[PDB]
Symmetry: D2
Subunit: 499 residues, 4 copies
């Protein structure tokens, strides 16, 4: 006998054993007499149109697929709960944090960044870590990564970056020349690249990695006072990674190493959990902060800004039907309950538009009416009507315009957002030449040891070696801007691999 | 105090008087603070992206519309029940007819044919009459008209025929020459054209007309014995028409005369009723029938085949939301429960493919999971999976392939189809030159009185005058082929209209 | 012998007499043997799946329809050129205004607001007047109306306003309680309501009405200096209106009166033309303006701001296919060539988002590659790829990421936008009670004569008649704020309409 | 200096050196001023909506993906020509076979079956070999595999087979119980399974395998005489296979081994080619044939029916843009030019519906107007109009109905199909118990040698060992029904693999 993943159908049969099998019907609910044989004229004659059983099944098979996620396609899923363990009501007035002990249902999806639906799991890439909270004040979507930082700091570059990471427009192959030519021309990627090419680029499953909000957010309390914050949900199972040697073996042996691994864990009772922290910065402290506090390529050092604990995330349930429950998941950074708000972070600004837009394409205009996406612990009432695939009462015979004298839904004045003062020329400001190396230098010298740095340069050199010599020499000097020995250690490796 | 239609919002406020208004939220359930004023920089400044209240409200408004029905676009809807009053179980084994007294829920839609969503109700056109029966053996959809016959008798001419009835491909106008250029080249339409331009072309609302299944269908009883049948469903309110004089006046004064009429009736307790009847033809009678028993341009005379009563359809409930309940209604002739089966009628065979096809475009692949389209009085179980906008559990983790050794749904042998024998060359057989005049001649001479024949020709000449003269005299020729006196009473008038 | 429109088919045959008719083919180009008869087993036997001729045609008929426009569904189109008559290079650097004599191809669409694809033309409602310019600096879309003003001055009320102008969500009938409940609660609409119920509410065709850009826009010259402006294109054919008597007869007699007229004009050589003017306001003149200069409910008086002529608009070409060239037209206010830019107008800012979004839904993601929508007078080169229905080379094997060291397209610094300084709070400012009556007080007393004031109230009283007494008393009070005698007239008519 | 594929961008810039790079523009053709920095209020302020450069780009990045193919999603592409070398005009009157030396433009797509977009190329599975011929009488799609047979022989079992080959609906993992439970319950798969698990399961790229039409097809010559046939493509590069050991290594070392191998071949001039053969069987010989001649699980032995040469397929051009030219390719078996027609093959009859159906969803209703899908060597003229994304003149102001008196396209009587007559009860005939063993026993004993049979069982036993014991015993028994030793060899390995 085998692992719980392999016995899915086995267990389905026994969990039903007492009952008789159900009647096999068409999509209109009409029972079928034969579904192994086609309706023809004579044993060796042509098929008939009158066979509406054949058409109904085949027509639905033809439309099984939907457009896959533009990024983060390869994914695993689970469900669970969030429990508050410490009081942070002085910072936020959000209902999700109201009192210690309070539980709220969650949903989580894991993913890579570049690989398609059929791609391998154990490859060097950032990891997706999206969490949906089902609160009474509507859903809260915290769409984070396994890294506190990202490769760029302007939303106009995101389409570009992605194109550089995927397949050549002509040959449809992954192209090292595309990969590093973007990175070498944009040194602000030197922070996140350094993260990606040492040990934590390939995590040993999804349960042995941390998760970060990365972006700075705003918190607002009852008194109407505001602060900025970071989110860090760290693993209780502890950080554990794969070696380059055997992570490559799993790519062919078991492409879904993580997918299987997550499912197996929950089914055998070992429910994975994470501990949620925040960091806090006042508007005054934002004014004296050395770098831009909304530069996504920057962290807040722990010395200057310690972690404040909030609660635990626990996943304790596997999905029943993957497509209906994990593939149709939609997370929107714009989904924020009263008390939590976005900062002027340029990269976060761009995510407010981009996500709701693509969902309307990928899933459909009424994608928020799908069960897993629905805000089922809140009362949705508005003046929105109609759209393709409307599934509920459509809010009945209620008036559909505002304002009105007929007692349709009303505003809630308390739920107004925070007021900030801004001024300056409305202009495209140059952020390409913000500090690209300081926090990177710190990472290299202070955080890594002598062999981790040695392994770090091997992993880069093993990937950069395929680019053109002008790209190589351009990238090396970018690495030299962090540390002379760092650039030179990479360069020593490249010189022999170029024969 | 005004008519019940107009006092919809007045009544909605009364039903809610005790309650206080709901919290206005986004689609993702977050309450909005202010939804009358925009988020800007300064009192006379620009708009921000950080306003997600605006973006998601506007984006949903953008996508309100779905493609209208390709035909029968303008529509009215109601709900009620089907009640069995007589026993016809010797003919059929369908659960909808299992015993006297039994009630079944129904859904009805009334419509014109050509006009678009904004067209007038009171125009000369056929009238759609669709009934959906929610049986325990799945949904049964009886999709009929207010005429026992149609304009053509082969499926390949349908798209063509429709185009001719709609708008010119360059000018986007109604074009008389198109209409009659088609009708004169296909003389089989004489029968349905003669019906259309009589008094019953323009009925006084939807409650004052009969319904007809038109097609020949098959009935099967428990023993496996089969008969052919027509469905005749007559009004209890009695036939009542509008003159062309007041029909033209109502066209501008009230574009939705029928729509209001139906709603007002149901709201005031004035429930509309029609009786269902059948005509039966044995397989033996079919072979000796002087005409083609499956010709959609032919009727079965009452003398040789009297009417057998079955039951009552009553409408007693108005829709709560028009879009969700009436505009998303789907009817499929292919939805046929055991006991009811198709005949070889050329036209009906085409409609098995067409309707499931078009609905997957208009509404979506998973359109059958829409409440009003859902078979809620049956259990759907099969091996169909995924597709955009999947709305239930997706049948859980149940095995998705057949056959299987894991007790997934099984076929029911009881539900096999009636087996018939056939012979002939597989080829395209010409139906142009079946008898096109005889049944028309009796209608003119035997059924109509002297005054009705006069108006019939006035109405044609009043419409045919707008075509070219070479088209006119070819159409006139067809009218003489029915009867010499018929043809030239029309011809005498056209020559008047030609100055 | 009849109008040129009705003789569309007649001409087509004459234009092709010398040629032989084409071979009738499937969509895939395969020649059809017979397309009047279905492939069946024996003369009275069932249809075959093997009939691939049938399916191909039948399936495309099923998907003929696309979602109609959410607003301004009923439309008419034409084509022509714009020609410059005076030099205003001192105000704008846009190449469309480079020198006197320069022509640019245009595309125009006329439309109503509320009516659907099948509605009447001769009805009281605003009239759309969108113009597309095909410049070398990309497409410019000026999407204006036949009025200088609108009903509301914040885009958050637009979805709500439209709902009130359309059909009730339950009854699917037009309801005057919805109309006047909205209008009476929002007295800022007093100005545009006065315009609509005046003589110019029902224009005599599309050739006898003015057109306005309505919004304040920003012009920029070669030195970098900027000014604000309004766009007026006044009729050369003259203003002419229809009586309430004449408009109502036409509603049923000719629903497409506007579509027929415009087509007949161009076809017969009688080409309609407009003269394009602008108003100019400096940044200085903007600060001292008594009202808000970007308020869409406000006009700029001609005495203080005279009209400066630019050029002529001529329509000289009918569309070849309505659907391909007029119904698939898409206009984006966001389409602005260097030299023309948006003001901070609250209503205009919303339209920058709304239009490109809705077109991706209505038509598709690649709606800009449809021939009539394409910028064919510019060379399109960027880092955008793929999408459903990709129609060109897809920009070949060019690098798809930016920046790059492989000489893909570069940004043009000349096309940088004008930099403005703003300051103030970031919140939602209340704009509901800016001066709503003064300019309306001017319209009533100064522009109209005593006879036109009499008819104005009559048109108002005849439609306000249908509302509830409490909505009536609210509306009259709002009108009384404009002028006491104006308010007292309307109610004086209502006391006679209430028996 | 590297391989040609990786130097694609390098070559692209060299091909342009003389030219200056283009100006980077929006989709509307408007030049952009900067596309590296956003439009904000101050250096650390919020984003504005009036920035339409961001939205236009971001909204198109959001819609880049379309649904992948329901099967055969992973792909590679190339183009070339078909050249006739022998005369087969006595069998077919098709223009593609008119005379020796005749060229036709072709398009070819290679693929696996089960794997999604991102999966590895070198895996055990059937391989797709679709060819699209661009003829004068429309496009011919000969959609074939690398195997003469298939796993099933009824069109109602196809969805079920596919579901069993792909991912479990709960765990989203590949499931051996799903795979073999099916195969064991349908013993007809014994023939194709035996092929799959042999050497020719894993081909050494796409250049070293044969391709087969599998289905029996109909050929009709100029006289109207008819015969049945098979299509065979044999490689001119020779059959060549990978060991499972090397195919596993490449799975992680090179996920796109096949795709690049093809591209590198063409680019270096080394063009791949295949030789087209046919088998022929007269109406006389078909009735005396030992098995069913339209059984997709059966071959025609070469002893009785030898190969007849036709021509050569040559690939000498790579795609320029993969997505526009390979991802949007659509092959329809229903696309057949006069002279080629379907047999009554139950499976082929079903493929006549499925492929046009799925494309309407995947790509869109007008998917044939896409360049690569378009029949650009024939003239498409018909009475099909409108539909989403209409891209040409839409056939102008031509009459849109048939028949008509206005010289619109006419049927071509010469292109009527061959007429056969069939008889027998119209009923659902059981196909489960046709001979499942004879031809398999042949393949095992005659074609394989000692060493290949030895590996065949090893390759089977290596996969079947992961299924349950009740399934193993059921599968082995089906292998025993082929040959005692064949069953016995498998069970000998299973006993060791079961510890
Ligand atoms: N301050 C921050 O929020 C983070 C900082 N860093 C890096 O550390 C530097 C110093 O930060 P500071 O807070 O002042 O000092 P600390 O020494 O307190 O920061 C240590 C942090 O480094 C993380 N870390 C350790 N090894 C790796 C690795 N191989 N890849 C990625 N992260 C790793 C640890 O994660 P864990 O706690 O799980 O052991 C821990 O959060 C920064 O310049 C930055 O580059 C890294 C992560 C976050």
């Amino acid at each position: 006998n085998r692992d719980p993943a392999s016995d899915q159908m086995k267990h389905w049969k026994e969990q039903r054993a007492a009952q008789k099998p159900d009647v096999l019907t068409t999509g209109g609910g009409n029972p079928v007499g034969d579904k192994l044989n086609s309706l023809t004229v004579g044993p060796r004659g042509p098929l008939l149109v009158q066979d509406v059983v054949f058409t109904d099944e085949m027509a639905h098979f033809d439309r099984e697929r939907i457009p896959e996620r533009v990024v983060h396609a390869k994914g695993a899923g689970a469900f669970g709960y969030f429990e508050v363990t410490h009081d942070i009501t002085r910072y936020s007035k959000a209902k999700v944090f109201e009192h210690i002990g309070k539980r709220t249902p969650i949903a989580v999806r894991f993913s890579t960044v570049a690989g398609e639906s059929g791609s391998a799991d154990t490859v060097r890439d950032p990891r997706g870590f999206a969490v949906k909270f089902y609160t009474e004040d509507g859903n809260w979507d915290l769409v984070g990564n396994n890294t506190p930082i990202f490769f760029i700091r302007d939303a106009l570059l995101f389409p570009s970056f992605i194109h550089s990471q995927k397949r050549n427009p002509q040959t449809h192959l992954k192209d090292p020349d595309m990969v590093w030519d973007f990175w070498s021309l944009r040194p602000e990627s030197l922070h996140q690249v350094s993260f990606l090419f040492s040990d934590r680029g390939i995590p040993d499953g999804h349960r042995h990695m941390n998760g970060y909000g990365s972006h700075t957010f705003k918190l607002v309390n009852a008194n109407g006072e505001a602060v900025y914050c970071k989110f860090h949900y760290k693993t209780d199972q502890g950080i554990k990674n794969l070696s380059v040697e055997d992570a490559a073996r799993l790519a062919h042996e078991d492409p879904d190493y993580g997918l299987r691994d997550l499912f197996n864990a929950i089914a055998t009772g070992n429910y994975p959990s994470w501990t949620l922290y925040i960091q806090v910065m006042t508007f005054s402290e934002a004014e004296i902060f050395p770098f831009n506090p909304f530069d996504l390529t920057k962290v807040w050092p722990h010395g200057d800004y310690p972690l404040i604990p909030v609660g635990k995330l626990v996943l304790n349930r596997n999905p029943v039907n993957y497509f209906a429950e994990v593939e149709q998941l939609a997370f929107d950074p714009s989904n924020m309950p009263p008390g939590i708000e976005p900062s002027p972070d340029k990269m976060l600004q761009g995510r407010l538009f981009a996500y709701p837009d693509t969902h309307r394409h990928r899933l459909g205009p009424n994608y928020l009416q799908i069960p897993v996406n629905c805000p089922y612990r809140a009362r949705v009432a508005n003046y929105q009507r109609d759209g393709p695939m409307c599934m509920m009462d459509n809010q009945g015979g209620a008036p559909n315009y505002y304002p009105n004298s007929f007692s349709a839904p009303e505003h809630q004045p308390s739920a107004l957002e925070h007021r900030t003062h801004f001024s300056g020329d409305v202009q495209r400001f140059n952020s390409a030449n913000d500090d690209n190396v300081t926090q990177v230098r710190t990472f290299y010298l202070k955080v890594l040891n002598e062999e981790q740095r040695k392994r770090l340069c091997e992993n880069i050199a093993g990937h950069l070696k395929d680019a053109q010599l002008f790209i190589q020499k351009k990238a090396v000097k970018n690495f030299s801007d962090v540390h002379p020995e760092y650039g030179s250690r990479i360069q020593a490796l490249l010189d022999k691999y170029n024969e």
